[PDB]
Design a binder for this molecule. Structure first.
Ligand SMILES: CCCCCCCCCCCCCCCC(=O)O
Lengths: 156, 136
């Protein structure tokens, strides 16, 4: 949906005008994402019959194969599992929320789609999982793939 | 992108000072809407009348965004239109209409019309968007 993409791009643009530095933009995007994810989870659980995931591995499958599909129409691949099962990566073929960056670069520190990391954290907090979501690769930063690394911290 | 995402994002934008700061917030919401409205026309529409352009906003444009048409279109034939939506989706108060004021203004701008767009809740959840076409 262009509607969401365009709205999110306008938001990022406005935040960058509001804040002198991109780290403050990143923080605000994450906050907004967290608040969205808290609400999104109730939408998601009402729309699917995923059962319930009795580990981080089953949760990964639900996120990648069901939730991303539902909301973004895409299926990231899951890779790089830690032997302890508390860490995995979502690999995407581009940046999921942003198509283009402006040249020349004036936002090296900006995590264009940091809102998505907040969404992930907020939605999982509501199912009693303290997690961390973080972009570790981004095609918009010149990487081959986009990679979101997911870590399970604690149960709540 | 599923519709839920836009709905949640818009709601998160409107909720997060003094009257000046609050005013600035409204203007930011409208301005973001303006940019989105432009980009929507740019993607959607590749109009031999102003009346035609307003019909398009009420029909195709409102459907693209809210998945329904405007319920009533009124005009004074002197440059003011009123667009009525009997159940405005972003309600289910003023703050919640600003972005959409911009959507309309930005959509019109890309179709060659300068306008000033304002809105009110007529009676919840019904809303009226007033479009004052500018000569320049
Ligand atoms: C801004 C784009 C939003 C799209 C983000 C999709 C990821 C949302 C996360 C919700 C899925 C939660 C899965 C766990 C539920 C369960 O344990 O059964």
């Amino acid at each position: 949906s262009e509607l969401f993409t365009l709205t999110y791009g306008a938001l990022v643009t406005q935040l960058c005008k509001d804040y002198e530095n991109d780290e403050d933009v990143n923080k605000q995007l994450d906050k907004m994402g967290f608040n969205i994810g808290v609400r999104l989870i109730e939408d998601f659980l009402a729309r699917s019959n995923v059962g319930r995931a009795h580990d981080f591995r089953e949760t990964a499958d639900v996120i990648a194969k069901v939730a991303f599909k539902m909301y973004l129409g895409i299926t990231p691949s899951i890779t790089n599992w830690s032997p302890a099962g508390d860490e995995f990566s979502l690999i995407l073929e581009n940046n999921p929320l942003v198509d283009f960056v402006e040249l020349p670069d004036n936002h090296s520190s900006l995590i264009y789609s940091n809102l998505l990391c907040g969404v992930l954290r907020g939605a999982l907090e509501m199912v009693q999982m303290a997690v961390e979501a973080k972009f570790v690769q981004d095609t918009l930063k010149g990487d081959g793939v986009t990679e979101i690394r997911m870590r399970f911290i604690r149960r709540i | 992108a599923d519709e839920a995402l836009f709905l949640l994002l818009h709601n998160e934008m409107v909720s997060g000072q003094g009257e000046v700061e609050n005013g600035r917030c409204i203007t930011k919401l409208e301005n973001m809407g303006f940019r989105v409205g432009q980009g929507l026309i740019e993607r959607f529409t590749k109009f031999k009348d102003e009346l035609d352009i307003m019909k398009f906003i009420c029909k195709d444009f409102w459907t693209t965004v809210f998945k329904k048409q405007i319920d009533n279109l009124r005009t004074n034939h002197q440059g003011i239109y009123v667009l009525q939506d009997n159940k405005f989706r972003l309600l289910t108060a003023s703050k919640y209409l600003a972005f959409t004021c911009g959507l309309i203004r930005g959509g019109l701008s890309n179709l060659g019309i300068k306008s000033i767009v304002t809105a009110e809740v007529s009676s919840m959840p019904a809303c009226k968007f007033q479009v004052m076409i500018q000569k320049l």
